[PDB]
């Protein structure tokens, strides 16, 4: 139940001036910029991702993230891919992206970067140790299965 990763989820949205500098028109649609605060966006995001989605319904999710939260479809798709499809890490992605002013957030558990994927395929003991310290064994095994199945 408890996890020390909760620090990445509990970032105070009121400390993030809206819209954040990193949130550009190449990533977000006009609807996004009509939210009144970071908290309002995050609360709508929570409502979307709390919906009923079967494992095969990434397209419906991406459409709802476009229509309700103003996230562009190609960006939602890229995020979903780097989260290994774990919808529970979507809020974490935006809070850390916005707080850090960096996309993707480079040092967040559950958010796989290009460097992380290269470490995974490297066969290097040290790189794998750092990688599992970041994401954990369970996520590392899921990521390997994604690569094995030609999903990445």
């Amino acid at each position: 139940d408890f996890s020390n990763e909760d620090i990445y989820d509990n970032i105070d949205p009121d400390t993030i001036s809206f819209p954040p500098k990193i949130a550009t028109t190449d990533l977000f649609l006009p609807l996004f910029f009509h939210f009144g605060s970071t908290r309002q966006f995050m609360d709508k995001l929570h409502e979307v991702i709390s919906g009923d989605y079967e494992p095969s319904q990434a397209e419906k999710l991406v459409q709802d993230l476009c229509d309700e939260t103003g996230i562009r479809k190609n960006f939602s798709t890229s995020i979903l891919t780097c989260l290994s499809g774990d919808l529970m890490v979507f809020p974490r992605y935006f809070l850390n992206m916005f707080k850090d002013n960096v996309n993707p957030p480079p040092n967040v558990p559950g958010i796989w970067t290009h460097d992380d994927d290269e470490s995974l395929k490297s066969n290097d003991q040290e790189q794998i140790r750092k990688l599992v310290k970041k994401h954990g064994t369970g996520r590392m095994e899921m990521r390997k299965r994604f690569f094995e199945k030609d999903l990445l």
Binding site: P55, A58, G85, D86, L87
Partner: peptide, 7 residues
Amino acid sequence: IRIPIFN
């Protein structure tokens, strides 16, 4: 999208 999703 082929990425399967979950909670």
